[PDB]
């Protein structure tokens, strides 16, 4: 219901609805793991060797681990093999002798493959007595008066993605590429950027897996990477180089307003830290990628066909939101998978 001759002060940085959403997604995400199987008994001493490959003496990245495992009955046991990534095994101290990385702190529930990870749009209908306003000014900075508001009973489609370096499938701005901040001359606050034109990314995993069921316990099944038929090929992502150069040209054109028209804007890779804040994290068909993005963020900008490849690394266990004793084991998925996404903005 579009209002008229009305001015309401908006401030996204001191908003409370984003904090309620960050609480609700965590609580609901924990509520979608309790019926699934806890993977306590698999935390056991592994005997691992290299995967069958023409090993070159410069990469691991796959491990062929044999171990004892209980059966349907409690008495018997079975020798069984699986394929784990190198970021999930740690050499505890012939063939070597490993263990899983989560075994030092906490056993972790695996995700039931009936539960999909993909986002569905989440609307926010206001309750009785309250109301939700909406800015509509196309040049809305982020803080201050929006002179064209509109009340609404329930919000638009918000699809919840999880991504770190550059956010995906995010409602894009209309007139031009926009930047947003709280105090631009402050360093601790991030500088959000929302695009006009969605630059496209294609990501894949070429390894043709084979999902294999192992019965840990009666009524509990464990899903292990059984075999790699086809060929061992590293996961990657592709963006168009021309559109990415054009899109960085747009954001450099926008950033020169806040900093002076004669400055040298250059982009660097991440400074360091843990894994999933330097690399680009997302999910793709239910399996979590981590993609190095130094190939996009190196340039310089003075006052006046192909496609960029960038490598990707995969973890099977994940610890998102960094709790004390909760990780999860994302089970491997059958066959080669790929997913296509528009890039809405970057941080």
């Amino acid at each position, epitope marked *: 219901i579009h209002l008229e001759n009305v001015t309401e002060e908006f401030n996204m940085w001191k908003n409370n609805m984003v904090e309620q959403m960050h609480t609700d997604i965590i609580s609901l995400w924990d509520q979608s793991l309790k019926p699934c199987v806890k993977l306590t008994p698999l935390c056991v001493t592994l005997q691992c060797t290299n995967v*069958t*490959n*023409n*090993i070159t003496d410069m990469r691991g990245e796959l491990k062929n681990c044999s171990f004892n495992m209980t059966t349907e009955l409690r008495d018997k046991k079975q020798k069984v093999y699986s394929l784990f990534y190198r970021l999930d095994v740690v050499q505890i101290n012939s063939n070597k002798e490993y263990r899983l990385i989560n075994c030092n702190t906490s056993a972790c529930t695996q995700a039931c493959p009936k539960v999909s990870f993909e986002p569905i749009p989440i609307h926010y209908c206001a309750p009785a007595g309250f109301a939700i306003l909406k800015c509509k000014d196309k040049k809305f900075n982020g803080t201050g008066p929006c002179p064209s508001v509109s009340t609404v009973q329930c919000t638009h489609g918000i699809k919840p993605v999880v991504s770190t370096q550059l956010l995906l499938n995010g409602s894009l701005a209309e007139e031009e590429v926009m930047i947003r901040s709280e105090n631009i001359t402050n360093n601790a606050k991030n500088i959000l950027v929302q695009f006009n034109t969605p630059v496209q990314i294609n990501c894949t995993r*070429p390894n043709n897996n084979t999902r294999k069921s192992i019965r840990i316990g009666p009524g509990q099944a464990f899903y292990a990477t059984g075999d790699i*038929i*086809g*060929d*061992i*090929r*590293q996961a*990657h992502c592709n963006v168009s180089k021309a559109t990415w150069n054009e899109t960085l040209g747009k954001v450099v054109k926008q950033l020169r307003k806040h900093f002076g028209n004669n400055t040298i804007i250059r982009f660097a890779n991440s400074s360091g830290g843990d894994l999933e804040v330097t690399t680009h994290s997302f999910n793709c068909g239910g399996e979590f990628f981590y993609c190095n993005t130094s190939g996009l963020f190196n340039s310089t900008w003075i006052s006046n066909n192909d496609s960029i*490849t960038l*490598p990707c690394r995969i973890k099977q266990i994940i610890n998102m939101w960094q709790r004390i004793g909760q990780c999860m084991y994302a089970p491997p998925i059958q066959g080669v998978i790929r997913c296509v996404s528009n890039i809405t903005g970057l941080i």
Partner: antibody
Amino acid sequence: QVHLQESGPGLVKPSETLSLTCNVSGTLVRDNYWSWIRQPLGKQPEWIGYVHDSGDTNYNPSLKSRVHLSLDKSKNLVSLRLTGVTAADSAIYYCATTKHGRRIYGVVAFKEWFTYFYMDVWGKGTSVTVSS
Amino acid sequence: APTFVSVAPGQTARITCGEESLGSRSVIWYQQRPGQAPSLIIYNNNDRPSGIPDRFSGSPGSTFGTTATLTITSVEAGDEADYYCHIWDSRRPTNWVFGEGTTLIVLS
């Protein structure tokens, strides 16, 4: 059109060194890439090693210990030097050029290719039988 | 150990050689006349050089879990010799020794 031929002793005692030759016809030695092939009777052949120009040379992992090779740069031949002949060396020896190709199967910048060699022509072969 | 395949002169003869495929392969086929050096016939998985006719066929090297096969159509007397396979597997390491040579013989 090429014509290549080796010349060795052909009558070798156990625990003895060994040498061979490679004459040229049609094409000299600095242009192409060279290899060595041996074959015991009633057996599949065995590919000893290959030499490039500018010193790129690789051998068997089994025969890594003892064999050594070189070219004859000014005289336009290829040499050979083997150490410690035993009863497992009686085989007709060959000489061959080789052509190499790439068989790319994936992303090229991630080093997902591999060279593969194939012997386009062949020598005529000399029997080098170990003689106790 | 050299297996024998026998077919009428004019029919097709198939030759299997080597370990079952794991990665992408690059097979090379030879031809050994008795008392001579070999002679190459197929240099890629299916490509053949000049002077060797197109009645030969190789198995394509983009199939996983099969065996490298050489297919001969319209056999003759001059094609009655030994064959050899040499697989370059993109997964298994370098083959420094050829496959087992199946001796090809024609009846009558």
